[PDB]
């Protein structure tokens, strides 16, 4: 027997690499930093071990979604002049949207440096902090200056495909019962992933991909209460947003070529912004979640859903973006039930204009007012739960870390490095 060298053997090792974007009005995650797309090959008898919790595509996608966010905010207005003293009065002076607003008057710079401009705007009470018609100031003014969300770029997520470079392959687990870890009997080599919409949300995985046959529970260590549980639905739960107000965006020229878009007036339906989830559909979806959740804790255990414990408004609420305006919904009527072995649910949502999105300090963003009435149709395709540390297990909604949102889309994918040079014995002998 003699050593014979084979070049091109189908052998791969696990690897971490830089996957390039691909996609098929400018966007935050635009197509100017991506590549046009064009595929899937079934690898029979191949049983690969996946790990959705130590996947580097999740860590890289988090970096890239952040990077495309900042890259889309540099070329537009920085609101340094908006740190002035505000003389704010109430809008209603008495349940409505107008009880959430302060009518703030301030001196603003003009396009001519030596001239001022007495202007006013309606600021949400969540954006103004009192100084001790009282005197207020914008909330993120002692920490940073808010680069205005540029009005011509949309926040709508477009699907992005992460494609492996040459010498690498993306393995896709086609198993329908694959939780997040261990062998996957059915594997495929895709050129690159399905369109992953970077939907940014907390406590609820809006839009995205459904499970195939049954609700899937995915935790790094189900016995550890410090680990989030990524529930994935099989049938989506439709959630409808609204801001009933007919907003009136107003433009203020704060400098040469720079405009500040302000809420000048609010008329129309002044009901508080809310989201509607069907009460029958949500009840049967939690029934499926509970059924798949007793498999890890016992048949006789009591599964109780409570509401978020505490913390920032971005972590205690179903924070999300819808129609360019950022909502923060309570979701305390969604998660309120105890499970023993036409109607709708209305979630009161607050709205903010000053956004510190990626759990960072020092880089805020001022989302300008959206003219008109905002309406919203989304699919709740998952959950992020945390368990409380007895025969009763309490599952509060979780979140905060944006990586668990994209870990729910990149759980089935894996990047490998092709090792095409292999040696093996054969009856050969070089002449």
């Amino acid at each position, epitope marked *: 027997l003699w050593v014979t060298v084979y070049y091109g053997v189908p052998v791969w090792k696990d690897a971490e690499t830089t996957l390039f974007c691909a996609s098929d009005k400018h966007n935050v995650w635009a197509t100017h930093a991506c590549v046009p797309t064009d595929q899937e090959i079934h690898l029979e008898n191949v049983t690969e071990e996946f790990n959705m919790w130590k996947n580097n595509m999740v860590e890289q996608m988090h970096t890239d979604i952040i990077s495309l966010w900042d890259q889309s905010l540099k070329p537009c207005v920085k609101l340094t002049p908006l740190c002035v003293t505000l003389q704010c009065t109430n809008v209603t002076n008495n349940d409505d949207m*107008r009880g959430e607003l302060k009518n703030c008057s301030f001196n603003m710079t003009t396009e001519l440096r030596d001239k001022k401009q007495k202007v006013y705007s309606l600021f949400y009470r969540l954006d103004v902090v009192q100084i001790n018609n009282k005197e207020y100031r914008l909330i993120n003014c002692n920490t940073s200056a808010c680069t205005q969300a540029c009005p011509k770029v949309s926040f709508e997520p477009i699907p992005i495909h992460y494609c492996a470079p040459a010498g690498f392959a993306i393995l896709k687990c086609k198993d329908k019962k694959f939780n997040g870890t261990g062998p996957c009997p059915s594997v495929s080599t895709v050129q690159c992933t399905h369109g992953i919409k970077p939907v940014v949300s907390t406590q609820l995985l809006l839009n995205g991909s459904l499970a195939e046959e049954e609700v899937m529970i995915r935790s790094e260590n189900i016995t550890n209460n410090a680990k989030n549980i990524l529930v994935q639905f099989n049938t989506p739960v439709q959630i409808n947003c609204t801001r009933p107000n007919n907003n009136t965006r107003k433009s203020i020229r704060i400098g040469p070529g720079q405009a500040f878009y302000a809420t000048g*007036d*609010i*008329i*129309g*339906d*002044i*009901r508080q912004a809310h989201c509607n989830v069907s009460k029958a559909t949500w009840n049967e979806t939690l029934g499926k979640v509970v059924k798949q959740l007793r498999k890890h804790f016992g048949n006789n255990t009591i599964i109780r859903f409570a509401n978020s414990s505490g913390g920032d408004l971005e972590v205690t609420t179903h924070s999300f973006n819808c129609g360019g305006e950022f909502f923060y919904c309570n979701t305390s009527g969604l998660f309120n039930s105890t499970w023993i072995s036409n109607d709708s649910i209305t979630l009161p949502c607050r709205i903010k204009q000053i956004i510190n999105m990626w759990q960072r300090i020092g880089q805020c963003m001022y989302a300008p007012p959206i003219q008109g009435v905002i309406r919203c149709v989304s699919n709740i395709t998952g959950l992020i739960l945390t368990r409380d540390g007895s025969t009763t297990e309490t599952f509060r909604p979780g979140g905060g870390d944006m990586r668990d949102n994209w870990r729910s889309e990149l759980y089935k994918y894996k990047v490998v490095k092709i090792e095409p040079l292999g040696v093996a014995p054969t009856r050969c002998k070089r002449r």
Partner: antibody
Amino acid sequence: QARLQQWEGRPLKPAETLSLTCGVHGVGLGGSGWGWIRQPPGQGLQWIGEIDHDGSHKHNPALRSRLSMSLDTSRNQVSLRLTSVTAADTAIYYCVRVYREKFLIGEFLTDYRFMDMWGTGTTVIVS
Amino acid sequence: AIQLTQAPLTVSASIGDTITLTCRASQDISIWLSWYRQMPGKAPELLIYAASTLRGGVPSRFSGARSGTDFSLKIKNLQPEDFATYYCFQSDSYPRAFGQGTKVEIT
């Protein structure tokens, strides 16, 4: 002391341009809206058109394509430029301020426009 | 468009009476209907806006009512300055319209 003053434009020949101008004192053109109301002799009042707070020009359907209004922010003046004037257009023209007050119905907030402040009168006669 | 019908076109009463003026709309214009008084030879002036609110300076005798179709205006303690032509003006639909005018005189 807030008043809208408009001055007589004298009789004008038929099939010409009707140029009106209202002088706004006490208050300014901003924030409200400014419109024109006429009154043919021995008859009721008629709405011609208005510019609302937004800068948007509501016009009466009867006067088709012969209507055009403008606001002189620098001089605080409201202008009317009715064209092709016929003998039926013999009426006293008033300049009005459609003021917006918000009235709250049970759950709905509306901008209600109610012509707060009236001009004095410009008797326009064509012959 | 919306047509406002104001009747009776001529109501006569002496000094110190109570009169009710009617302005019927075509559609339902909610409560958006303002009332204007034109003294003979002068310019019209605002009396009531939103069919119930009194203009600043109008005496408390004047009063309106109704938020459907049959809008009404009531005058109490008639004085010679009240003998003018009243107009009802709707503000619901952008083709704005006026009433025909109720000429109130002395008997």
